[PDB]
Amino acid sequence: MIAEPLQNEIGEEVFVSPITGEIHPITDVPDQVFSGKMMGDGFAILPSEGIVVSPVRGKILNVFPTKHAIGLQSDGGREILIHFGIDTVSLKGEGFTSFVSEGDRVEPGQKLLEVDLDAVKPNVPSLMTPIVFTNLAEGETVSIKASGSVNREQEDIVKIEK
């Protein structure tokens, strides 16, 4: 009855996969806020590609204080919070390069950050890059499909669905 494979052909819930790496449930993130969901729903990606595109750009809501994080909005319904690795904030983004100079209103994907993961990793306790969605049209559960490896710009990886 619980038909898990609700993948769909057009399984792109305004989500052109942001990074290539390994997906992990939000709970796995070594931080209370993320681990306990606190601000919303979401998941972690342990990244590989030092190139980060956007699930949706839509409209950049807020910039990074220390290049490691950003706030986005699709249209008016899904507001997103991103964090890139852990303690990268502390690292002052030493190895980061920001592509969006947060000119808010933009179309999806197109690189948010380029980030020297290779050099960042040894300088951080964890590479967990959590993505949280707050408002989530007050009912969108973040139905993870790709409970394993993930690749950039892919579809049917996570489904924001009721």
Swiss-Prot record:
Annotated localization: Cell membrane
Deleted gene: phenotype: Deletion of the gene reduces the growth rate on glucose but has no significant effect on growth on glucosamine. The gamP-ptsG double mutant grows slower on glucosamine. Deletion of the gene negatively influences the growth of the cells with maltose, N-acetylglucosamine, sucrose and trehalose.
Induction per the UniProt record: Strongly induced by growth on glucose and glucosamine.
Function text: The phosphoenolpyruvate-dependent sugar phosphotransferase system (sugar PTS), a major carbohydrate active transport system, catalyzes the phosphorylation of incoming sugar substrates concomitantly with their translocation across the cell membrane. This system is involved in glucose transport. The system can also transport glucosamine. In addition, plays an important role in the phosphorylation of EIIA-deficient PTS transporters. The EIIA domain can transfer a phosphoryl group to EIIA-deficient PTS transporters, enabling growth with maltose, N-acetylglucosamine, sucrose or trehalose as the sole carbon source.
Organism: Bacillus subtilis (strain 168)
Protein name, per record: PTS system glucose-specific EIICBA component
Domain PTS EIIA type-1: residue ranges: 31-135
UniProt free text on domains: The EIIC domain type-1 forms the PTS system translocation channel and contains the specific substrate-binding site.
Residue numbers annotated as active site: H83 (tele-phosphohistidine intermediate)
Lineage: Bacteria, Bacillati, Bacillota, Bacilli, Bacillales
Range covered out of full length: 538 to 699 of 699
